[PDB]
Write a protein that binds this ligand. Structure first.
Ligand SMILES: [Ca+2]
Lengths: 205, 206
């Protein structure tokens, strides 16, 4: 029954576990995890317990064990195929992103603008969206959607028909996709607006 | 009282919708029309608007223009915010070229620690060294789009805080440490990527 927020905190806990490891720390605790993640110790334990990670009495959690557990729950211990649709300014930027990690592998780059289709990129070349159906099935599970707002939906349509499994949407719009498809939004205009609201209303936050 | 964080997000959606209705010429909308377009009950819509005071009782339908104005004022979109980007890497450079910031968000600075980047002209400006935040932020830059590698994020955020920034739209995969008088919003695309991973492996859950 896990709430959507918990999953986002796990992600944060895991990032924290990676930093602890790099520092050579073997054991951590809910108190420490909470301090570094800005949430109550109780919350940390509540989140972890959802999935069965409890740790050891008066000792806490073993860093590498919890890390293995979280990376498994979050599916980060798999290799996911990725693609970018919309090789504009942001798309080209994400193509050169050096922090995808070992968990996410760019296996395609697509666009409809002929000026872009054919252009060489790190990891390959830009292909026309028309080729999505002979590139996605069994090769690309996630697609980063980076096209203008007025084109996102239609692009998502191609993606879905092509057999995509998940879409990370950067367009400021709500995509209509079948329920077998996962969608997650990265809308920074909304983020900017929430910041504006928060600046004017300090007691709120 | 005090709006739920979830409502603020919906108001943003409602506004984007009204904007689109104004463009279509539609003059009168309603809680049921707004709800369907935003995919929520009309009750939710009335409830979100409830957190805000009105002259008599709210609710026949809404006049697009009037509702639009109201929501913009609530969200602070009727003000002109000064923005800047810190970390002119591939992502920061893309954000700098973004043409859809609107009339509400105005870029007034671009900063990086790499001396090999200072001097570079960019849409509407030039890259300056971070050492200049204290001279360029006061009085004209309230929001900072932070786009530096994960390991320099907290450091850069400290300079920004010391420079007098009022808000940080953080793109780095970390939880920033900042005084409570400084607002922070995270745009974590890697976390979204991980959220997708989880969602694809657990369909019934969603
Ligand atoms: Ca203007």
């Amino acid at each position: 029954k896990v709430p959507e927020a918990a999953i986002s905190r796990l992600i944060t806990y895991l990032r924290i576990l990676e930093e602890l490891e790099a520092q050579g720390v073997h054991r951590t605790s809910s108190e420490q995890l909470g301090e570094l993640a800005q949430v109550t110790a109780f919350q940390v334990r509540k989140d972890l317990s959802y999935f069965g990670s409890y740790g050891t009495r008066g000792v806490g959690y073993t860093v590498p064990v919890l890390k293995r557990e979280l990376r498994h729950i979050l599916g980060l211990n798999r290799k996911w195929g990725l693609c970018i649709v919309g090789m504009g300014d942001l798309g080209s930027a994400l193509a050169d992103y050096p922090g995808f990690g070992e968990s996410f592998e760019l296996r395609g780059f697509f666009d409809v603008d002929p000026e872009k289709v054919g252009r060489p990129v790190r990891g390959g070349v830009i292909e026309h969206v028309d080729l999505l159906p002979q590139r996605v099935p069994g090769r690309i599970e996630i697609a980063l959607l980076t096209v203008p707002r007025e084109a996102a939906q239609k692009a998502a349509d191609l993606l879905v028909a092509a057999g995509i499994k998940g879409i990370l949407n950067f367009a400021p719009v709500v995509l209509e996709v079948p329920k077998e498809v996962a969608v997650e939004n990265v809308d920074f205009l909304a983020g900017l607006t929430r910041l504006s609201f928060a600046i004017l209303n300090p007691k709120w936050r």
